[PDB]
Amino acid sequence: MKITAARVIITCPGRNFVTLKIETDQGVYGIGDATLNGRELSVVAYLQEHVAPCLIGMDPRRIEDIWQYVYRGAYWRRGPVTMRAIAAVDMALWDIKAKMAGMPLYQLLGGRSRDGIMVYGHANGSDIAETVEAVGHYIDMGYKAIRAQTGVPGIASLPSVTGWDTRKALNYVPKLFEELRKTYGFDHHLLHDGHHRYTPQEAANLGKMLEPYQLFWLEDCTPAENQEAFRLVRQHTVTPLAVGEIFNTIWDAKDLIQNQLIDYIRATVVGAGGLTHLRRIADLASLYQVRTGCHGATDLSPVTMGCALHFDTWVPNFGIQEYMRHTEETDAVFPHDYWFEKGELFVGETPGHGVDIDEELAAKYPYKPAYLPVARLEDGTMWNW
Amino acid sequence: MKITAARVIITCPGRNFVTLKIETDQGVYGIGDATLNGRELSVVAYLQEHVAPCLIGMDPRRIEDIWQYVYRGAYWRRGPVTMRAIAAVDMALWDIKAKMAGMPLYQLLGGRSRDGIMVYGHANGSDIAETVEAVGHYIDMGYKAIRAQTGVPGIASLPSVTGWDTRKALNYVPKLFEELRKTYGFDHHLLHDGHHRYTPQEAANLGKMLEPYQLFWLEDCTPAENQEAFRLVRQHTVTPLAVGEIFNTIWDAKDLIQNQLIDYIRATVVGAGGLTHLRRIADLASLYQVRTGCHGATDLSPVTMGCALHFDTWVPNFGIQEYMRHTEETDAVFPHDYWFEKGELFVGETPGHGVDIDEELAAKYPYKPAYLPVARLEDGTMWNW
Ligand SMILES: O=C(O)C(=O)C[C@H](O)[C@H](O)CO
Ligand SMILES: O=C(O)C(=O)C[C@H](O)[C@H](O)CO
């Protein structure tokens, strides 16, 4: 058995998505997500111009070997572009193996550990009043967990520039959660995304102020290239901590996990090298009772969601799954076997990861440049968005 | 003052090279290296399709702000592709600032700390006899330091597959250095590149066996994604340790440095985000008396070498500079103001980093795909090349 082609497909059914399709001389084929929001074409080149030519002729059944080949063979290891390419290959290969086995992917990973996959939605508002309303809406839709984000009073052809001020946020954010618990009580899981805006001391300060509100987690409270950054936070607060959507290898989280500085690892199948590698991250996390909390914004295509759900269905130390709804056009371009119902996602029995791509339809939505925004402090200082 | 264009130029005068040219409305321009061996086009896309459009209209004098903008603004941080792009921008901007100041780059960094730049050459042989002869050649040429690599008995358009066996190497490499010292004595600096082939224990074993031969350094002895990997080596041998050519940010070396696990940091201007970032790496290293030993293979264009030499001329804790001669064609495409003389490199007084690119000549050498080799053990296990 041999790989006869590894093609990259680009489409924009509401937003940009890059997909890798691996074809074999035995009819069966697999697809993987390679989307890197804001830098999509760099991954297209990485795959199309370098990796794909190497895959031709290889035995697609050798998932581990190919993973090691692309990971070690690159010589320059790790990285967002590098790991997105590896992830696309890995997803496509697991898709092929599950199809060949005649089973939905989760069966190959070890079988079902749960029925439904708990998710959380995004309740946003320009102020506390509006955000409180948004959370109520998600509660009415049957969500068990809701992430609440509010604008702070006083604070995509090219990157939009957003402003930020820590003191203003510190004086406002706690009030949001105080009102939420006062309004809806403590039955629902409430989440907050710090989005890399605080220093460790400020994150500890915020976490402490949020303690009486029992949050499910405070996410990405401070930049984590330095894994010691969560030390001060963990030492001063019991508010659960989550991090990792931008991580791409287990090396980005090894210390955060072993030093027990986090409660949830947010790494994803597309961000951290496919099922092959994400499984290793989850296993390490399980040793310290850290649970998975896979990132799941819309810039992760339905192919990733399919793989993520198969993973979530099997993984023992499952925590929660982020869920942002894709547009109808995206759902049409990426036929998938998973659905949402009363606060939970469910993956189907379709062999493979259950997702596919309609190449003919995909071609009707041409690529369109789009950037993530950037953030600057009031004095103009480049900050973390 | 504004950036009017940020163009990517590709040329293959003996091997592939990618250059970024930043033009301004004032007229002055700067160039930077963006070459990523074996994955060159991914950086081309990263710069051409994403970063470049953002630079237009920016004030090229704001080197630090632009570095932070591209680094933080990408959202997905670090990585070989990411940092190569950032380095190309940084090199071009420093080139511009030095031209505007009317001074060679080293003057802007803090002035001259030394006259010549000590380098090491590459003595290679199929066996010990041949390698010993090769080292004698570099000694003849006036090299104060020589890297010695030998083939081990019993051990392009697509990646070549090389073989490897640790036990065979462990039984042979020590003999190479024993013969070198017996033949040439201890006056010259002798280096060895383990090239990621050993586990920490084996590296510690090799390190101890090489101790009687007083090496300048044992390089990349074991894969370092896990910075704790050098612990065992450092605990068991006094042989100097070097690592870092594949690193792209200070985060890849922070622990190796602070835990005093290495003696030389090999990060480069092109690999680790330009002068702006490499400077921070060098400063951290100096606190622990770790010295710079910049990587300098041919896949680093003359633009990188120029910037590297300006850096080497100033940096207080300079250790050594690797030097692999480029082809005559490459030197013609990249006119530079630096030269070699009796084991030392010297940077010139030309304002900027002293290097430029002849676009008309560059266009005569079209890109040609070339991959780095991969390594497999005797049983077929994918290994580190
Ligand atoms: O939903 C979240 O948790 C996010 O932070 C969304 C991210 O900004 C987005 O996926 C970046 O592409
Ligand atoms: O010369 C050295 O130290 C090297 O290891 C060379 C590398 O293999 C080469 O630059 C990779 O592109």
Ligand SMILES: [Mg+2]
């Ligand atoms: Mg987030």
Ligand SMILES: [Mg+2]
């Ligand atoms: Mg080396």
